[PDB]
Amino acid sequence: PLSETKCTLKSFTVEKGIYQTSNFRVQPTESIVRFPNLCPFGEVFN
Amino acid sequence: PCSFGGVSVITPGTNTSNQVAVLYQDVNCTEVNVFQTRAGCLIGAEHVNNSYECDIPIGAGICASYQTSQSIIAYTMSLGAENSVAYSNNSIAIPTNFTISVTTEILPVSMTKTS
Amino acid sequence: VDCTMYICGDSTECSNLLLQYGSFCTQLNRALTGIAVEQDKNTQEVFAQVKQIYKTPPIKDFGGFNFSQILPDPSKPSKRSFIEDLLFNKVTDLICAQKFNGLTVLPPLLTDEMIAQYTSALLAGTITSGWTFGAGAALQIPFAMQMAYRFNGIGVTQNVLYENQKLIANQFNSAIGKIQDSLSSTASALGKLQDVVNQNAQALNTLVKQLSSNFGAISSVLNDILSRLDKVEAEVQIDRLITGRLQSLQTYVTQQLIRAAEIRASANLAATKMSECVLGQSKRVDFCGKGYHLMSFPQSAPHGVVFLHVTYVPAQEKNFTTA
Amino acid sequence: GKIQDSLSSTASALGKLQDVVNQNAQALNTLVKQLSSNFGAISSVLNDILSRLDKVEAEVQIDRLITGRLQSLQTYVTQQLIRAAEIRASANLAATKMSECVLGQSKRVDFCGKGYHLMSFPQSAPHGVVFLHVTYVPAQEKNFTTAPAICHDGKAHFPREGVFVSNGTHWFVTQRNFYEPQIITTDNTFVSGNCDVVIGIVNNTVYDPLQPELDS
Ligand SMILES: *[C@@H]1O[C@H](CO)[C@@H](O[C@@H]2O[C@H](CO)[C@@H](O)[C@H](O)[C@H]2NC(C)=O)[C@H](O)[C@H]1NC(C)=O
Ligand SMILES: *[C@@H]1O[C@H](CO)[C@@H](O[C@@H]2O[C@H](CO)[C@@H](O)[C@H](O)[C@H]2NC(C)=O)[C@H](O)[C@H]1NC(C)=O
Ligand SMILES: *[C@@H]1O[C@H](CO)[C@@H](O[C@@H]2O[C@H](CO)[C@@H](O)[C@H](O)[C@H]2NC(C)=O)[C@H](O)[C@H]1NC(C)=O
Ligand SMILES: *[C@@H]1O[C@H](CO)[C@@H](O[C@@H]2O[C@H](CO)[C@@H](O)[C@H](O)[C@H]2NC(C)=O)[C@H](O)[C@H]1NC(C)=O
Ligand SMILES: *[C@@H]1O[C@H](CO)[C@@H](O[C@@H]2O[C@H](CO)[C@@H](O)[C@H](O)[C@H]2NC(C)=O)[C@H](O)[C@H]1NC(C)=O
Ligand SMILES: *[C@@H]1O[C@H](CO)[C@@H](O)[C@H](O)[C@H]1NC(C)=O
Ligand SMILES: *[C@@H]1O[C@H](CO)[C@@H](O)[C@H](O)[C@H]1NC(C)=O
Ligand SMILES: *[C@@H]1O[C@H](CO)[C@@H](O)[C@H](O)[C@H]1NC(C)=O
Ligand SMILES: *[C@@H]1O[C@H](CO)[C@@H](O)[C@H](O)[C@H]1NC(C)=O
Ligand SMILES: *[C@@H]1O[C@H](CO)[C@@H](O)[C@H](O)[C@H]1NC(C)=O
Ligand SMILES: *[C@@H]1O[C@H](CO)[C@@H](O)[C@H](O)[C@H]1NC(C)=O
């Protein structure tokens, strides 16, 4: 995370202070698919 | 949606050190020495109680400076140096002597004319 | 505001194209950072002109001038004048949706509890030390004498104050009481502040709604254009998304810059009043408000400052033959 | 002398100027680098689109260059307008100081810089100006018991200019911002009202210039 800021200033000298390096994101673990009549196969087949 | 924020690399000049203290802004500290802040998740600078004048502003009055060997620290920004003026209804304080200071003041006037 | 995430929601298909517009993504951050950096310079010069944090003595005899309204409330966890808290009521989730698209609201470098130390110090210096703490080491001087000066500043010989001291006390003390009644029911007097907070959240809102607009493309959802079509078409559509959103940023950004300067000039005026009015006595006329000016007491307010100008207004006249 | 080293030994004092010059050269670099961006067109070289493709299609391509570049100017232009409007504000601040501070003497507290202001010396700097403010800062304090007024005969005497003080024995009228104690005489004080009103008035004898001159 230190090397990525020096690429923002393009300089090998980094002046005393705070610099904003590229943002980070939390990434997703997994996908969650969720779906909630009935067809009368108990009324047709039985 | 999952938290996110600007990484901020807090450093003294690369002159004095190669050591950086990263500030993850506006995240609780999990998703990453670790110190939770009001501004965000600050990694790599040991907390300090005794508060000094601000050095490198961060946020919410947290100012980081390099010195103690040494390691980047972070602390609640102290505002000036406290004074309590000794005061009473008959008490006056008259200066007996003076100094003459010359203070540079710098202003832009024009900018490069481009067409 | 993160251009990459704002324009292109978490999707490289759009992220690639954004690389073709070059610095448009970055230079906005440079612009916004350019604003947010100086936003603390404003608060820097306005509130902290003072070298040291003064605090009033434990006991108050000012000659009958009751400051217990304006001085820090010792009991509130955040020490703030009884007045200041009126303000924090009158001025006022939205942040969450903003927080969700790449719109982040960085914390003001100085917390309100810090501002309340400055506006305590300046206010506690002005009371005890006269104005001399702006020019150097604060000098304890009897307040009831300090007024004998500030009249000479308006041309009234001081023999008026020592004689009228009591009458001036109640006129001051009561005039304070009127302030707190005004704020108690006045939403409008903070209109200047309330407008500034509004106009930002306004353009912030509008900035967000622009994520729901088609901009001519077949939908305003980034992925729903993708999974509908084979990407070589999406490369075309996502333009009209990017071209739309990228613009909508530059609209919003260019706004902020203009609006920033508007605050910028206002911040300069606040520093001028803080410097001249509070730390001095302003010979300028109607710069500190109608009437000849005696002193001002700053009071913090959210994203702003509130001066209480104590001004000397003549009253009863008598026609005189003169030569 | 120290103004030399203040400038000589630290390069950050001029940041204000240095920031202006950089931001100008900054946007120019950015404005130039925008020439090399595709903006959705097949290439950033205006001739290549003309070389590879037959014009009828190349028309639509060059739009994305033009629309991109032409926009990219308005971005740059708008920045300059906004940025100049800042300088335009800073210029007036100088012209205000130059007129009031240099040419006159300023009564505006901390407009010319911390302290009571004596005089200012303008100095040019690239695309800017630098003022040397010669200011008067008091130093050494001595706690004094003070009184707002002095009863003499039952009349009250108030300091004509400055205030009364004593070191604890003899009451001294003096000027406010520097300590120059002076024996109290009627030429230092004007009479007003009488004693029973003024809070904190104290006893003393206000010496008369005239009375001694008499006796012969
Ligand atoms: C007022 O202050 C100045 C310095 O702040 C004093 O100047 C010094 O005086 C001493 C005499 O004891 C000399 O030895 C020094 O060389 C002086 N300093 C300089 C820089 O010239 C001055 O004496 C003070 N005046 C009074 C009345 O105390
Ligand atoms: C200054 O004003 C405050 C309130 O404006 C006074 O505090 C009140 O004192 C009375 C006693 O006379 C109490 O009954 C009230 O409950 C107090 N109010 C609050 C809010 O504390 C205070 O006494 C005044 N002091 C001076 C020196 O004027
Ligand atoms: C100056 O005006 C004030 C009112 O602003 C006068 O003070 C009032 O005097 C009456 C007596 O006639 C009292 O009943 C009031 O209580 C006083 N008011 C206050 C706030 O104390 C004052 O007498 C006037 N003085 C002159 C010389 O005209
Ligand atoms: C306060 O200052 C006055 C003015 O100098 C002092 O009065 C003189 O003090 C000196 C001290 O050596 C005596 O020699 C003089 O005779 C005094 N003058 C007169 C007219 O009596 C006074 O002593 C000072 N007091 C303190 C406590 O500093
Ligand atoms: C200043 O001195 C006068 C005397 O010249 C003091 O007046 C006396 O005050 C007391 C207190 O009420 C009375 O009992 C005396 O009768 C007064 N003297 C005369 C001659 O009538 C006055 O009190 C002194 N001031 C202070 C603040 O002490
Ligand atoms: C930076 O390093 C140089 C030597 O390379 C030194 O002279 C200077 O004092 C350093 N600056 C700081 C702030 O330590
Ligand atoms: C962070 O999470 C912990 C529990 O995991 C909680 O105690 C703490 O209050 C949280 N802080 C923030 C700022 O979310
Ligand atoms: C501050 O002091 C407290 C005790 O008062 C201690 O628990 C805490 O660890 C200290 N923190 C730092 C950073 O010194
Ligand atoms: C002075 O004279 C004018 C003449 O019209 C009058 O109106 C005014 O009331 C007078 N002043 C006072 C204090 O009455
Ligand atoms: C005046 O008295 C106060 C009492 O606390 C003290 O702080 C101050 O230093 C004194 N002034 C001088 C010049 O000693
Ligand atoms: C000053 O205040 C004290 C309280 O410490 C009081 O005893 C004295 O009478 C007051 N004197 C003046 C002149 O205000």
Q: Is C64 in the pocket of ligand 2 (CB under 6 A)?
A: no
Give just the sign of the alpha carbon dihedral B9, B13, B15, B21. Answer: negative
Contacts of C29 in chain A (CB under 8 A): 20
> What are the tokens at B18?
């190669």
| Half-sphere exposure in the Cβ direction for D157 (13 Å, CA) | 24
> What are the tokens at B22?
């990263």
Running DSSP on this structure, what letter comes out for residue C14? H
Running DSSP on this structure, what letter comes out for residue C47? H
Rounded to the nearest 10 degrees, the angle between the axes of helix D15-33 and helix D55-97 is: 170
CA dihedral B92, B95, B96, B100 (to 10 degrees): -170
Phi/psi zone of residue D124: left (φ > 0), alpha (ψ -120 to 50 degrees), beta? beta
The amino acid occupying position C83 is I
- What are chain B's partners, defined as 3 or more CB pairs within 8 angstroms? A, C, D
Mutate which of D169, D183, D185 for ligand 4 pocket (most atoms within 8 A of beta carbon): D169
Ligand 2 atom nearest the C-alpha of C173 is 28
| Half-sphere exposure in the Cβ direction for A36 (13 Å, CA) | 2
Measured in Å, residue C63 CA sits from the centre of ligand 11 at: 10
Q: How far apart are CA C267 and CA C277, in angstroms?
A: 14
Residue nearest (by alpha carbon) to ligand 8 atom 11: B49
B1 Cβ under 8 Å from any chain C Cβ: yes
Q: Is C181 in the pocket of ligand 9 (CB under 6 A)?
A: no
Return the residues preceding each gap in chain A, C–N over 2.5 A, or none.
Answer: 36
As a three-state string, the secondary structure of chain D is CHHHHHHHCCCCCCHHHHHHHHHHHHHHHHHHHHHHCCCCCCCCCHHHHHHHCCHHHHHHHHHHHHHHHHHHHHHHHHHHHHHHHHHHHHHHHHHHHHHHHHHCCCCCCCCCCCCEEEEEEEEEECCEEEEEEEEEEECCEEEEEEECCEECCCCEEEECCCEEEECCCCEEEECCCCCCCEECEHHHEEEECCCCCCCCCEECCCECCHHHHHCC
CB contact under 8 A, C139 and B95: yes
Other CB atoms closer than 10 Å to residue C265's CB: what's the count? 12
The amino acid occupying position D143 is N
Nearest residue of D to residue C276, measured between CA atoms: D109
CB contact under 8 A, C29 and A20: yes
CB contact under 8 A, C139 and B1: no
Q: Is C319 in the pocket of ligand 9 (CB under 6 A)?
A: yes
Residues with CB under 6 A from ligand 4: D 167-170
Q: How far apart are CA C207 and CA C103, in angstroms?
A: 10
Running DSSP on this structure, what letter comes out for residue C212? G
Other CB atoms closer than 10 Å to residue C89's CB: what's the count? 10
The DSSP bridge partners found for residue A19 are B9
Phi/psi zone of residue D179: left (φ > 0), alpha (ψ -120 to 50 degrees), beta? beta
Running DSSP on this structure, what letter comes out for residue A24? E
Q: Of the candidates C245, B31, B23, B33, which has an alpha carbon nearest to the alpha carbon of residue A25? A: B31
D143 Cβ under 8 Å from any chain B Cβ: yes
Three-state DSSP class for residue C7: helix
Contacts of C239 in chain D (CB under 8 A): 40
Residue D157, min C-alpha distance to chain C (Å): 9
D83 Cβ under 8 Å from any chain B Cβ: yes
Q: Of the candidates D188, D181, D194, D180, which has an alpha carbon nearest to the alpha carbon of residue D206? A: D188
B53 Cβ under 8 Å from any chain C Cβ: no
Q: How far apart are CA C62 and CA C168, in angstroms?
A: 12
- What are chain C's partners, defined as 3 or more CB pairs within 8 angstroms? A, B, D
Mutate which of D151, D195, D199, D202 for ligand 5 pocket (most atoms within 8 A of beta carbon): D151
Measured in Å, residue C289 CA sits from the centre of ligand 2 at: 29
Q: How far apart are CA D39 and CA D52, in angstroms?
A: 18
Residue corresponding to tokens 């000098």: C139
Running DSSP on this structure, what letter comes out for residue C21? G
C144 Cβ under 8 Å from any chain B Cβ: yes
Please say whether the beta carbons of D64 and D40 come within 8 A: yes
Quote the distance between the C-alpha of residue B10 and its chain's center.
11
Q: Of the candidates B102, A32, A40, which has an alpha carbon nearest to the alpha carbon of residue D135? A: B102
C2 Cβ under 8 Å from any chain A Cβ: yes
Please say whether the beta carbons of C225 and C234 come within 8 A: yes
| Half-sphere exposure in the Cβ direction for D213 (13 Å, CA) | 4
Q: Order the strands of the D182-183 sheet from edge to edge.
A: B91-95, D141-147, D163-166, D171-174, D182-183
Contacts of C2 in chain A (CB under 8 A): 23
C10 Cβ under 8 Å from any chain A Cβ: yes
Contacts with C, D 165-204, CB within 8 Å: 176-177, 190, 192-193, 197-201
Please say whether the beta carbons of D115 and C279 come within 8 A: no
Other CB atoms closer than 10 Å to residue D74's CB: what's the count? 11
Specify the DSSP element, H or E, that contains B6. strand B4-11
Q: Is B3 in the pocket of ligand 6 (CB under 6 A)?
A: no
Measured in Å, residue B8 CA sits from the centre of ligand 8 at: 25
Q: How far apart are CA C255 and CA C55, in angstroms?
A: 41
Three-state DSSP class for residue C237: helix
Three-state DSSP class for residue C293: strand
Measured in Å, residue B49 CA sits from the centre of ligand 7 at: 21
Residue corresponding to tokens 């990434």: A27
Three-state DSSP class for residue B11: strand
Residue A36, min C-alpha distance to chain B (Å): 23
Task: Please give the backbone phi and psi of residue C179, each rounded to the nearest 5 degrees, phi first.
Answer: -60, -45
- CB-CB: which of B7, B18, B64 is closest to A1? B7
Residues with CB under 6 A from ligand 1: B 97, 99; D 139
Three-state DSSP class for residue C70: coil
Residue nearest (by alpha carbon) to ligand 8 atom 10: B49
CB contact under 8 A, D148 and C145: yes
